[PDB]
Design a protein around this ligand. Structure first.
Ligand SMILES: [Mg+2]
Ligand SMILES: [Mg+2]
Ligand SMILES: [Mg+2]
Ligand SMILES: [Mg+2]
Ligand SMILES: [Mg+2]
Ligand SMILES: [Mg+2]
Ligand SMILES: [Mg+2]
Ligand SMILES: [Mg+2]
Lengths: 117, 151, 55, 56
RNA sequence: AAGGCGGCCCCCUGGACGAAGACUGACGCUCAGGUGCGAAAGCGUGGGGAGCAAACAGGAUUAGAUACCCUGGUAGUCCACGCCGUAAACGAUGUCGACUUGGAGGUUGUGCCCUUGAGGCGUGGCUUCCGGAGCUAACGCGUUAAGUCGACCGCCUGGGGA
């Protein structure tokens, strides 16, 4: 319906899940898919493979604009940091730049207590 | 196999064609040490497959085996309380063994009248890469490509 | 001798992301490590150096 | 750890670079460190212990 | 001094150390009673309130689960001015002084050397790890003593009861 050809893959990779969002340079959301909503729950949801099909499913709800180049923004420590990026590149995508944007406070907010499991 | 590595017994070749490979096959099909009756079923299946499917008996065998041969597989593994699935690239000798073994097993799990007819139709199906045995290779790969991340 | 205004020299002691490089890696004396970090900190406030690669 | 792929460099090599830039940068270590509150007494305890192990 | 003190800048201010020489002339050490300081939690009044989180509510686990885990969340954690005077407030080692073999480092002054190299030779303060004699029930301590001595203080006298 419209045209971009130049995008950015923001991947949010937490421990429990990994959300993939495709966007233009402006930061406007073009398409998105998550692992948790691609048929993966709990123990399987938090896997690199689930992040992979997330990246794959996302490349199908965006090529309506015919993106052809993009940059990658890796946020968080979970799986699908890396495997998500791979799936994008195999789905027919030229990777321009890779950047980690995981936030690091300069020691500000006190985090939750340690879990005594 | 904790300490002692080993070689492998190098069985005699198939009596009819002089093939070690088919000796690995008759043995795999063999049951209750009935060698005499095992090779009888393998040949009649090869004879059924050979006669009425373009001949080249050894080659016919390979066309079918070429199709059920698996390039990679997964090896279960238990690390930090987790049972991870590690996809391992599998070696040529066993590649044949799995290929042969799945063809034999799919043959007995079949509806036809005798093991020879079953064996023949399994080879034929495998030759056209279809049926149970080929499907066994594909599940192995679907299962492998899935855990590609941990190789 | 060290001055926060000498951003040329200061750059040798920060990472790609503007983080101060520890004395270990640089092998700089311990008295001056402090002097450097105070000049890098001063230079940051005055926007003569970035705090982070972000900006 | 910002990375920019150069021409006729495979996607893989650039990636391996990126992962080593983060290995170099200490991102995941850093995120692990902050997931949960650590008491001051505890991090002082950690600090002594590693000083000690750092004698061979 | 201990409690404890960590972004950057200024202002007010305490202590420590070095170099050189001048001045005072035993003015010193210790200290029952006394006075002051003293983490966190807690208390009172008024502010403040992002995150965290006693209490409390809900979801789970479990034979039970007034817990551990999850979703929330009040006091509190923050500021001012008062109170409290306690901790495994620990080096579980009172303060001061003199004396007694060594090795490797960290930190911080200062004298000397074609500064001719990021050094070469000395001389103070603090500090970490080994270790010698000696000490010690052993563990260990070992010139920062738990060694060899002296001055003064505090304290102990079987466990429970306390
Ligand atoms: Mg006189
Ligand atoms: Mg109050
Ligand atoms: Mg809670
Ligand atoms: Mg109250
Ligand atoms: Mg007491
Ligand atoms: Mg010792
Ligand atoms: Mg001794
Ligand atoms: Mg008594």
């Amino acid at each position: 319906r419209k045209q971009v050809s130049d995008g950015v893959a923001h991947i949010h990779a937490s421990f429990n899940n990994t959300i993939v969002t495709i966007t233009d340079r402006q930061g406007n959301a073009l398409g998105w898919a998550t692992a948790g909503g691609s048929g993966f729950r709990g123990s399987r949801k938090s896997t690199p493979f689930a992040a992979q099909v997330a990246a794959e499913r996302c490349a199908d709800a965006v090529k309506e604009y015919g993106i052809k180049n993009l940059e990658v923004m890796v946020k968080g420590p979970g799986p699908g940091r890396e495997s998500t990026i791979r799936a994008l590149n195999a789905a027919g995508f030229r990777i321009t730049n890779i950047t980690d944007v995981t936030p690091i406070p300069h020691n500000g907010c006190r985090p939750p207590k340690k879990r005594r499991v | 196999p904790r300490r002692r590595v080993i070689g492998q017994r190098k069985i005699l070749p198939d009596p009819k064609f002089g093939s070690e490979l088919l000796a690995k096959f008759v043995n795999i099909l063999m049951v209750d040490g009935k060698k005499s009756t095992a090779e009888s079923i393998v040949y009649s299946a090869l004879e059924t497959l050979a006669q009425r499917s373009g001949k080249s008996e050894l080659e016919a065998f390979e066309v079918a085996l070429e199709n059920v041969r698996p390039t990679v597989e997964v090896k279960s593994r238990r690390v930090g309380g987790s049972t991870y699935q590690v996809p391992v690239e599998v070696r040529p000798v066993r590649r044949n063994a799995l290929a042969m073994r799945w063809i034999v097993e799919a043959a007995r799990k079949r509806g036809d009248k005798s093991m020879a007819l079953r064996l023949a139709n399994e080879l034929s199906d495998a030759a056209e890469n279809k049926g149970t045995a080929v499907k066994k290779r594909e599940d192995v790969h679907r299962m492998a490509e899935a855990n590609k991340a941990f190789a | 001798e060290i001055d926060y205004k000498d951003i040329a020299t200061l750059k040798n002691y920060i990472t790609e992301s503007g983080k101060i490089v520890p004395s270990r890696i640089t092998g700089t004396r311990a008295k001056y490590q402090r002097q450097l970090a105070r000049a890098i900190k001063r230079a940051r406030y005055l926007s003569l150096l970035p705090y982070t690669d972000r900006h | 750890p910002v990375i920019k792929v150069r021409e006729n460099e495979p996607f893989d090599v650039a990636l391996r670079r990126f992962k080593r830039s983060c290995e170099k940068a200490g991102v995941l270590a850093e995120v692990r460190r902050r997931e949960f509150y650590e008491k001051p007494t505890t991090e002082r305890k950690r600090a002594k212990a590693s000083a000690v192990k750092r004698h061979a």
